[model samples]
Target: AANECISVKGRIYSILKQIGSGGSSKVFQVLNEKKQIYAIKYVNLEEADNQTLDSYRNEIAYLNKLQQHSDKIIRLYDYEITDQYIYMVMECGNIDLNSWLKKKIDPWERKSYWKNMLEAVHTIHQHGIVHSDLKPANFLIVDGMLKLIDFGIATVNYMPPEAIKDMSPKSDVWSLGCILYYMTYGKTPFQQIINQISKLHAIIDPNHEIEFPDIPEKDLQDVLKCCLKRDPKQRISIPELLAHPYVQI
Candidate 1:
């Protein structure tokens, strides 16, 4: 989101690999002139819906909004709009967060990994945008730190109860709780409904807290309890979460 493009020369790119795909766009793995790898988001506009195109356009705006400020979020170095695709040139990573977590064995280290996730979301919230989608797939693990990606679904999924009436900042906080549960335990809150639902009404059922991993760390268990409070008003704020013993380490 700067004068950064593949360049003013508009050279054609050599596609190395197709990394990922989604409803809004597909990503390609490619190399820059310096041979640094970059993931290109190939978003097609002519075949799009109103929402999809808007997401692609807003992505440019939002990433630019955090250009000099965000480390946990992915950086958009350059972009190109050929007649066919809005090629978003972005920071590439070692792997997505879910895949990376499965390979690591240390429990405490995993806590530190998602520390990047929480801090990233905290920064986004600080700028007045809610990352409504906070799943592991949205986090890219690079050089052991996380760089958050995919804002297309950011303000779209897993609405909080109050958000059903009017989306509030706390909605992102709830998604953060869902993400905490996911990173710690390797799954979403409801096993099935967590991915598709608005609010967590299904799990909030006469439930003290959503489930946790088998005998999780004492600090982590406390953190989950604090975050998963059903009422947004009762929920732990980001500042409080940043101070929590589980992440303070």
Candidate 2:
């Protein structure tokens, strides 16, 4: 069979392969006439419920508004909405941070990535928006720099106590902390929890304390604590995190 192709605004793009997908959407690697590569996210409108459609709109709106403010945020090149599908042409990445984290990385490189992650989150907060869904998978390594992607709704595992009721900028701070904890320990802060339902309850319980394993790097440990504070007011804001010595280097 001939290669599949798609045209947007009269420009043709040859679909290379599917790169990513969710319930009602699929991302494909496509190439233009000049051999320029881009990811086209195709969302099937018919399969998407009202909430899912709204989330797609939310992702596009947030990406359009904030993509200009920071290179750390992923670029949204173009988009087209038809009767049955939504096509978003976006910057392509070799891999996501989640897959990269599965490998063994040395301390030096980990710190670099850790700081890069913070920079991405810091940029979003500066634009007066919250990237409620923050995780390793949501950050893509495009051209060796960590670029934040996916501005969809929140995920329970990474959400803070207050986020269950309402989300603030600090909710992102909590997710950032979880990412750091994963970076350090090779697992999420609550990775040991067996029951999903109980994990949700445990995460939101203000009185429940998060266990910390002692490591030689106290600065890293301290910063994680600063972010994971159950109280949104007590959590370290992005501004403070950016200025911290750990991220400064």
Candidate 3:
């Protein structure tokens, strides 16, 4: 249902559909006056705290930084912010990986997806950033490629942790292992605690340690094995993961 439209950069990007919503924002499938479709994230600045607002600003900055560098990262074509709102005109995706998995995507496709995401995250790291939230839902399946989105702000230093620190880029490697585990097992290795109910891994290790099944392919298994190591210091680095022979295939 269309109620009203927002004006940005002197163009009328009318909302055709509400594609997503969470935190303090709503995403709409909008079209410019020419009828070209785009996804715009509308963040209402009314009730957000300083930290929430800061995260949005960081995401905008990170997207802007990656706009031209990472092929697998989502594209942010335009953005505008007002005293009351923030608008991000981003690439439109047909479905997220979480949704796409409900269909019959090829296993080979899954392997390539691992590479695409790994490469993109590697680039994200090389750029001195980390996708604080990395998961299937944060990744969209467009055409045949996986596009990583929703970059987060983090004060992380990957120093081969001798102890569990606040957060690290390798946290994403843990997430990548979880995603790869999902690709093979059709679910995350850690059991999903209902919202605030339960708890959950290196990537969280050793398959048996996390009670995750062995992957369908040896490469997938090895990636997890290397990434899910009990020690964050021992988990695979982006360069090492990308350089892994499994990703080569």
Going through the candidates in the order shown, the clash numbers are 2, 0, 2
**Candidate 3: which pairs clash?**
174-203, 201-204
TM-score for every candidate vs. truth? Answer: 0.80, 0.88, 0.84
Per-residue C-alpha lDDT of model 1 across residues 185-225, encoded as one tens digit per residue: 76656664545453345544544345666654788778777
Against the true structure, what is every candidate's RMSD? Answer: 5.1, 2.6, 4.4
- What stretches of model 2 exceed 4 Å from their correct place? 47-55, 153-155, 165-167
Mind giving the per-residue lDDT tens digits that candidate 2 earns over 72-148? Answer: 88888988876678888899999888888877456676677777777777776676768776888988988867888
Stretch of 10 with least lDDT, candidate 2:
151-160
**Maximum-TM-score candidate:** 2
Give the runs in model 1 whose Cα sits over 4 Å from its true position. Answer: 1-9, 49-52, 82-84, 101-105, 152-167, 192-201, 207-209, 212-216
Candidate 3 overall lDDT versus native? 0.73
Scored against the true structure, residue 25 in model 3 reaches a CA lDDT of 82
* Order of models, best lDDT first: 2, 3, 1
